[PDB]
Enzyme design. Sequence first.
Site: not given
Ligand SMILES: C[C@H](O)[C@H](O)C1=Nc2c(nc(N)[nH]c2=O)NC1
Ligand SMILES: [Fe+3]
Lengths: 336, 336, 336, 336
Positions: A169, A174, A214, A233
């Site tokens: 993902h 990203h 996202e 993804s």
């Molecule tokens: C890479 C992993 O998804 C990372 O720890 C996090 N991603 C996200 C997160 N919080 C949000 N809103 N969006 C994310 O993509 N908290 C932490």
């Molecule tokens: Fe993400």
Amino acid sequence: REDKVPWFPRKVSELDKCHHLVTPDLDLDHPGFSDQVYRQRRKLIAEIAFQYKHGEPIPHVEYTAEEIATWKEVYVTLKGLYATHACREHLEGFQLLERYCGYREDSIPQLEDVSRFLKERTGFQLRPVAGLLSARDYLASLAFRVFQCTQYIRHASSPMHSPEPDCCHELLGHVPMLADRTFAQFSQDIGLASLGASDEEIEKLSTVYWFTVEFGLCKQNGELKAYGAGLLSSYGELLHSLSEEPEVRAFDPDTAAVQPYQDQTYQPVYFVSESFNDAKDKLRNYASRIQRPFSVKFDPYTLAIDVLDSPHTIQRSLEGVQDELHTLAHALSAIS
Amino acid sequence: REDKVPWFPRKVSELDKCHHLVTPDLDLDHPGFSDQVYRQRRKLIAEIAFQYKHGEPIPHVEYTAEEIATWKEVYVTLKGLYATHACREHLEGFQLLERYCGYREDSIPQLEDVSRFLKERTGFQLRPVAGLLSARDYLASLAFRVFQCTQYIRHASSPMHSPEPDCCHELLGHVPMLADRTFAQFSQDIGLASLGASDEEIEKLSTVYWFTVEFGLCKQNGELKAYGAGLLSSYGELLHSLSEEPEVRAFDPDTAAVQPYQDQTYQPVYFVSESFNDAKDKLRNYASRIQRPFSVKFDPYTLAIDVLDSPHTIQRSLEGVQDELHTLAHALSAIS
Amino acid sequence: REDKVPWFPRKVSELDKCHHLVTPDLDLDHPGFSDQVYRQRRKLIAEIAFQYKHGEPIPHVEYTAEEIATWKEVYVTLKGLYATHACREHLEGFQLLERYCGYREDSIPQLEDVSRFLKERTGFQLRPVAGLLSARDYLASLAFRVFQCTQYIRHASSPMHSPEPDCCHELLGHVPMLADRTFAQFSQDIGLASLGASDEEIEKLSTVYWFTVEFGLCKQNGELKAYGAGLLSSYGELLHSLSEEPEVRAFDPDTAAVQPYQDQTYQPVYFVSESFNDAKDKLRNYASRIQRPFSVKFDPYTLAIDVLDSPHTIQRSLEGVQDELHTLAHALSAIS
Amino acid sequence: REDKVPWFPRKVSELDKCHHLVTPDLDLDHPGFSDQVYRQRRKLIAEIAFQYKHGEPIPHVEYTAEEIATWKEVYVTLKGLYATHACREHLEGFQLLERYCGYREDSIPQLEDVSRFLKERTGFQLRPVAGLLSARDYLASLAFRVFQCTQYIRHASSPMHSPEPDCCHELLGHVPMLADRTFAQFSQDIGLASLGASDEEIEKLSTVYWFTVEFGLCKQNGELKAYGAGLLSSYGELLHSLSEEPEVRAFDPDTAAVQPYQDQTYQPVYFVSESFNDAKDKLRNYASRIQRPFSVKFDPYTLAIDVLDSPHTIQRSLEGVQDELHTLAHALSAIS
Ligand SMILES: C[C@H](O)[C@H](O)C1=Nc2c(nc(N)[nH]c2=O)NC1
Ligand SMILES: [Fe+3]
Ligand SMILES: C[C@H](O)[C@H](O)C1=Nc2c(nc(N)[nH]c2=O)NC1
Ligand SMILES: C[C@H](O)[C@H](O)C1=Nc2c(nc(N)[nH]c2=O)NC1
Ligand SMILES: C[C@H](O)[C@H](O)C1=Nc2c(nc(N)[nH]c2=O)NC1
Ligand SMILES: [Cl-]
Ligand SMILES: [Cl-]
Ligand SMILES: [Cl-]
Ligand SMILES: [Cl-]
Ligand SMILES: [Fe+3]
Ligand SMILES: [Fe+3]
Ligand SMILES: [Fe+3]
């Protein structure tokens, strides 16, 4: 979370304190919750995150053949939807990752080679993360153009579906958009706006992020395309996002900030931005109306955050801007 | 040196090719030319330079007690002239190096800890160098805010005099001024102007550098002070530069660019700038009159050089400037 | 109309040639088409326009009691809808006209006193016009912040309805919004974009103007309000524009540029802008996509148009901008 | 003169109150002090000043043949030194005055035709003045790009020498340099800096003006040239200023601000600026160090003075600057 104005990092070096906040181990529903060899794999991997200090090369991970297997599948099958469903920014960035970062179906890319690539392309860098960070800490990292990135692969039994963000993902969803200049700035802007904001503002911001980074859609040559990582993804969500099933609204930071959402099933609502420059402008007018007695500006030479809370600190930044306008005045005479 | 417009680096990564150009081993006159244990010490050290690749932590060097000895002397005795002979920028930076970089008389500082410190302070970084680089390559490195820095100490028999630049001269003479924002920009500007310039222009530029970075004087509260590294690292030259013996002229980039000079004996002429902002402005008007069909502008997010050779590339940079002015507009409303 | 690039004025003085293009006398349907005393009144008045040269005070007109009568009615009855139907900009400007320009029900204001007032408020000025000018000439005048303004009153038998623009429509419908800084710039921008554009582009521009300056709506505190002069000067259209009868679309320069329209009956479609800064930005992105091998920028010190068609002319303007940023840098230190 | 911060005009219209302060009739030594026909001529003329209101065309004066005679002499004989002694700006402007403002030896030019010419060239305008104004009022007028200008000719018996400024001195000494963009801005800057300054600061400013606008020298292609009006209108002083007799110092606002001077005999000291852009920069750094709790910026659209005394008023101006940078961004894409 902290005080009248919650503590926030002012030096990239300080992200080393905005990691102390996570959440580990699996749930019943998860693809390998009941696989002990896999639970061992994860703990080993998370450990690279827990040990990581700002500035060190990111430790390589030797992927097992089955891990490479799970990767080969996610890859090949999303590869097949990109030409028709992805935004131009994602195609351009995925092609560069292939040409210079060994993106391929039979090998999982290493974080340090990807970070290096992003650094020379947009100034973004990766930081290995153990899995889901607090909203404030994640957005705070985006402020320094640092992407908190997972290193472990999803369980091999359900290669087409992964609850938590995995390296598939991160690397396929990203990273590619982060190679685009405007998107990279849009992403940092969200983190820049989050710095020292109330938990409520963080919440609104996380939501703007959700509906953009996202799960955002954009229009190009009057066609609708995905740019959200959660869409790029996911084989199934990708098809559905461009279908006639969900509703698509104009991207507007205020509407999105309060649109509710769930995460187990596909999105019933998405927001389309007209261009990233447009969504970037809309997002800055939005953090503008954010209650704050100062503003922040990134110092790219030192990877620090300058707090602009007085005529003097604003004048100091203005000088940097005035230096630049001088350089452009000179380039105009040089080219005649 | 190269073509109509000589090749120049556009990515910090490319400095790895602007090192292939040096000059090793000692001369008869040198303090330890006839010391074989020392000649071994140097080859070992140079080797760290020859092996260095952009981006790796700089290898620590374990200094011998006598090396630390030579250091303790150069240090203590220059320390004694700084309060009266040094510019305010040098005192401020030397104090910070002491408070956060373990600058002290009984220990030689390690390049990697110093580079780290400069990076967070002005964006400058060090690169270990084997000893005297070509003018074009040295100035080209200054363009990315990279200081080519020697790691070996001067021969212990003449601690008060060192022909070639040594780590004492680099760490006590250059580094401290590089912690000042305006000086750091002045230094990069010289390298920025050198990029793809004729060998003759490189020559004029090296000379401006000599009379500023290496042997410049400035006036503060109507008193004259040294800021040139060659002065801040030389007990004798430092006293003489503020004496009634040499002649001191107003700093003017054109006059200095053609002032001849030698390097074995003290300087008979020095140029005083009124303030670094003033010498910075004078120097940019100077590279402005430099024959060039483009102009360059540093991209701090990617450590690259953007060539501005068309309306479009100038417009692209302008956009970055327009983003910034937006941020400042917002900071003005936030602070009321 | 003229050449590959039609001739356009570059000096405010040249508007004296963009008047040679009109259309006089009445139609069957007109309120006093069959009144010979009135047809004499008009010819006398038009004559002030035909004789006018850029820069002379505008000749006063001694209004007859019945003319003042027709005025007293249009006035009083529109006055009654403003508090509820007008945008804040119009209330603010109408109040200033009353406080300093003797706007009142028993006296028709004189163009020269109004022009004087606009000049000190937004830099706009009036020019007496004989009645309906070519699209290109009218928009070309807006480029110098010059409003082509009628001096004759509408026929006294139908004070509530006037086909052609009269001084009631100019003074009560346009002038007040022109006292607002953002609106004044929006108006000039339309004229600025029209300069040397194809007849087709002029047509699209006239239409944008129609749907904004003449019949635009805006939203304020989530309520819908009129700002179009054709609405602010028409009792009936004003009520209908905020009713449930017509359709109101988001203002978008491209959609509006091709929306057809008629002029005898009320408008079935109107466009709402979110704020004038927003419609101003949307309109400039629009003239941006306009096919043109140069761009224009107003010189307010000389009331001239600078054509920016080379690096050099752009650099020259940049210098003026750099002067200004300097002044702002100083104001920041002065206020601490 | 007025309060903690003396009253100053904020609207060009208010210059009508900064005239109430003069000084009339002649002294024993004056060329026609004992000519009653001439004393009548002057009172008649002064009267046009005393009656003048901002914005009215300036009343023409019908010059008598002897007045035209005195003019023909001053003219012809200075004409003869210009090619060798005048700065390029003065030659360029004198040629334009000849080509479009009927500057010639047998006719005195009329203020209104000259004002018109300056307005379209640099935005400067003339205001008829009765003779020597207070320092503050004269500099305050320069702030709106308004030159207080005398209309009466000097007494015909000594055409080569005139104590007080006359129309010969104004029209041949000042006006031409005011047609140059950089000089015009330098002049306004002096007045801009004077606004609400202490009487002492006014004094320093008057002196900077004396040594520049009235008696300044500049260097061009390494030759020394006059640009001061007091030099361009004086046959004898002009020769002496470029001779080996007086001393010439580098122009420096602080040194000049306190250089004493007399006015009956030629100047023993003059200051040479390197270029008007250079003296303009030096002068702004100078008003920068001026004690003031605000800063001023001219609004050319309204001929008003904006006081920048808070983040908000600075932000408001910044917006105008941001509009402009937008226009330049567009001109860059249009020209490719
Ligand atoms: C890479 C992993 O998804 C990372 O720890 C996090 N991603 C996200 C997160 N919080 C949000 N809103 N969006 C994310 O993509 N908290 C932490
Ligand atoms: Fe993400
Ligand atoms: C650090 C060491 O002195 C370095 O290799 C070099 N320094 C310099 C140089 N050339 C100039 N002009 N000035 C320097 O300080 N060549 C290379
Ligand atoms: C004031 C009088 O209406 C003036 O002559 C004109 N107005 C307009 C015009 N054309 C357009 N599109 N809009 C106007 O308001 N032509 C000329
Ligand atoms: C035009 C006439 O000289 C005018 O009244 C004044 N000139 C000047 C003045 N004061 C100064 N310092 N310099 C001038 O040229 N006072 C008023
Ligand atoms: Cl885009
Ligand atoms: Cl400084
Ligand atoms: Cl608004
Ligand atoms: Cl110049
Ligand atoms: Fe050195
Ligand atoms: Fe109208
Ligand atoms: Fe004078």
